[PDB]
């Protein structure tokens, strides 16, 4: 065992040496001549009300119009952001919902939480009333995220340190990903839906191959847990935020961190991030009731979406880049522009 | 234009339902039931269940008031993430194994809960559920509480001690010493935003529900008074 650990330390040192060899220059120097974005003075344009308790997650529709929200009073609600009219009010079996999803074709939405079970709902039923269509079991820890590859495959990640791929039609785990030593928190599919990433509660991020069911790369550098993650639009980069009160940007080919976003005034932890359509603005949420705007290529801040009366716990951007939502333990969704 | 009437009709029907729900939601109290493994927690939970998956929910009502108690299960021991979900519960029951070094683990856990920021507004109830076992351990003499607790050597029964009939002075001394360790934690830095309610319990105490009922009522009254800025 001692020899194994020694030569493993040798491998880790070799990896660190290899990564260090590829760091010719800093990201800032390359973008040292990019003009500042300027003051992004965004303001609320709508306000959606009806939730009793806090809000954990929401997902946009593929048309940039419909969106679904999940709260801990046991309710899923599909709004029409153009007119703020409710369309459905879906009760839940387990009131501790910790995530939600919106199917690409717009027919299904899935949610799950401490119950460990990811449920599938149908929005195009013949009767017209949404009803359960498939309940997926097989995890042994609270489920913390879920996204749709298509109408027939949902990828789920849980707190027992394992991410799994499901075949909705049968309910079996076609594949299971392992290699994490802590809770897995957030993930996001690639633009092509070939690869996805997930950072866990060990300050590490791992890139996975969906087809082969095995880890492809590993990234480190954070000091504490990881709460949010997301792919850059081109699919060749992804930025992560941690409880250490910092955000960072990686690249799947550089195999190393390229930039960090930090400020001394910030002593709280991030809870959700997301990019813009052009991938030029890195939004983010914080525990101190604010949401910041980070100019991705310059490391600076360029705007604050203040207005929330409690922690921000979710965020997103429409597929066409028109509107941005936010949710909070205050129980109120806001639409900015 | 017909669609707008069709949609506006839909919204009204939905809003009628949510307002119907809102009333039901406020009439239910939520209680998280922590507890060490060897604490007899399951015994007290079964006691509540008889008289009236990653989580288990038990519903019971007292005096027409509805309490909703959630007991964790099938989770890993790393509590620092799925514990945030319980910031809005009315209270966090907490069973402890007094007679058991288990007790030090309970002290550290209680401190960690007390000083956490998201939970810095959720009052915690406290139970001590091995009084008979502690009494027999100390009475038998082969326990030597002094070795693990040197401070217990110079401790004396507090002036306000009220012992049950037939209770030996040594038993009372030990029992009340156990509690003092936690109260040192629960008094400092309290800030008056949340309190602790110690009790001495037994596995088969019928009135375990009554204590939590009264303490929930007290928490509600304190919150309301603080709202009006009286206390």
């Amino acid at each position, epitope marked *: 065992l001692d020899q194994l650990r020694q030569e493993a330390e040798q491998l880790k040192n070799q990896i660190r040496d290899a990564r260090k060899a590829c760091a010719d220059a800093t990201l800032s120097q390359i973008t040292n001549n990019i003009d500042p974005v300027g003051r992004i003075q965004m303001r609320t344009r709508r306000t959606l009300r009806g939730h009793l308790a806090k809000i954990y997650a929401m997902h946009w529709g593929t048309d940039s119009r419909l969106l679904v929200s999940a709260s801990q009073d046991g309710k899923l609600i599909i709004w029409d952001s153009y007119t703020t009219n409710k369309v459905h009010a879906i009760p839940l079996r387990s009131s501790w919902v910790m995530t939600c999803a919106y199917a690409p074709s717009g027919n299904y939405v899935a949610c799950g939480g401490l119950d460990n079970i990811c449920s599938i709902y149908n929005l195009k039923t013949r009767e017209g009333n949404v009803r359960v269509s498939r309940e997926l079991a097989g995890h042994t820890g609270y489920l913390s995220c879920c996204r749709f590859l298509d109408d027939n495959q949902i990828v789920t990640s849980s707190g027992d340190t394992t991410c799994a791929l499901w075949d909705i039609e049968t309910g079996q785990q076609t594949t299971t990903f392992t290699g994490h030593t802590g809770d897995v928190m957030s993930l996001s599919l690639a633009p092509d839906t070939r690869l996805f990433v997930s950072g866990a509660c060990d300050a590490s991020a791992k890139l996975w191959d969906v087809r082969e069911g095995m880890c492809r790369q590993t990234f480190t550098g954070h*000091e504490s847990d990881i709460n949010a993650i997301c792919f850059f639009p081109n699919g060749n980069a992804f930025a992560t935020g941690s409880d250490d009160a910092t955000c960072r940007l990686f690249d799947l080919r550089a195999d190393q961190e390229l930039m960090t976003y930090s400020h001394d005034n910030i002593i709280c932890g991030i809870t959700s991030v997301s990019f813009s359509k052009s991938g030029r603005l890195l939004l983010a949420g914080y525990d101190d009731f604010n949401c910041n705007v980070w100019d991705a290529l310059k490391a600076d801040r360029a705007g604050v979406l203040a207005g929330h009366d409690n922690r921000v716990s979710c965020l997103g951007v429409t597929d066409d880049g028109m509107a941005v939502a936010t949710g909070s333990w205050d129980s109120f969704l806001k639409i900015w522009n | 234009r017909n669609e707008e009437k069709a949609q506006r009709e839909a919204n009204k029907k939905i809003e009628k339902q949510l307002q119907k729900d809102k009333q039901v939601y406020r009439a239910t109290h939520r209680l998280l039931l922590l507890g060490a493994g060897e604490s007899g927690k399951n015994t007290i939970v079964k006691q509540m269940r008889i008289l009236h998956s990653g989580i288990f929910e038990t519903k019971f009502q007292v005096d027409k008031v509805n309490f909703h108690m959630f007991d964790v299960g099938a989770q890993r021991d*790393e509590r620092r993430k799925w514990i945030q979900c319980f910031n809005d519960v009315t209270a966090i029951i907490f069973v402890v194994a007094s007679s058991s*070094n288990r007790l*030090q683990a309970a002290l*550290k856990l209680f401190d*960690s*809960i007390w000083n956490n920021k998201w939970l810095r507004d959720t009052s915690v109830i406290l139970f001590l559920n091995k009084q008979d076992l502690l009494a027999e351990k100390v009475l038998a003499g082969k326990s030597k509480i002094e070795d*693990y607790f040197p401070e217990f050597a110079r401790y004396t029964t507090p002036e306000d001690a009220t012992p049950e009939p037939g209770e030996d002075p040594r038993v009372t001394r030990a029992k009340y010493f156990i509690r003092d360790e936690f109260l040192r934690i629960s008094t400092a830095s309290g800030d008056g935003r949340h309190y602790c309610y110690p009790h001495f319990t037994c596995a088969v105490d019928t009135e375990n529900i009554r204590r939590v009922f009264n303490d929930c009522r007290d928490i509600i009254q304190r919150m309301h008074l603080r709202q009006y800025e009286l206390l």
Partner: nanobody, 125 residues
Framework: VQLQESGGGLVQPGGSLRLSCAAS????????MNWVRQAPGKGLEWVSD????????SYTGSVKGRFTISRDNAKNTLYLQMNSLKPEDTAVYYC?????????????????????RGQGTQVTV
């Protein structure tokens, strides 16, 4: 997060020995630290923790007055001084860290599979 213990060895009962824990990979001053040991056939047991700057201290009752805790934030180190060992204290010592910075709570440091926990050194009497 890298934790590197050192200073173990063999000592006759009643002797003395010092444990020197070295750390790197994060801002040392911000994190509350602990010493936690594992004896054979026993679950993890807690010993002593010290605050960010050394203001506060604590011990488990059994080791009261025997050991001592101390840290040097200037040198990225944690220390433990032992005196008058007893036969029933043979165990491995895990230099430990609390998860989140700038906080006072230290959830689940003694967990079975904590992430920010050192490999540890052996001290036998």
């Amino acid at each position: 997060v890298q934790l590197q213990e050192s200073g173990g060895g063999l000592v006759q009962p009643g002797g003395s020995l010092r444990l020197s824990c070295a750390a790197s990979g994060f801002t040392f001053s911000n994190y509350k630290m602990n010493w936690v040991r594992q004896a054979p056939g026993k679950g993890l047991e807690w010993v002593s923790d010290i605050s960010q700057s050394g203001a506060s201290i604590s011990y488990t009752g059994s080791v009261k007055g025997r050991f001592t805790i101390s840290r040097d934030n200037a040198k990225n180190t944690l220390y433990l001084q032992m005196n008058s060992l007893k036969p029933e204290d043979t165990a491995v010592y895990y230099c430990a860290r609390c998860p989140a910075p700038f906080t006072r709570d230290c959830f689940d440091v003694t967990s079975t599979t904590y992430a920010y926990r050192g490999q540890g050194t052996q001290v036998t009497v």
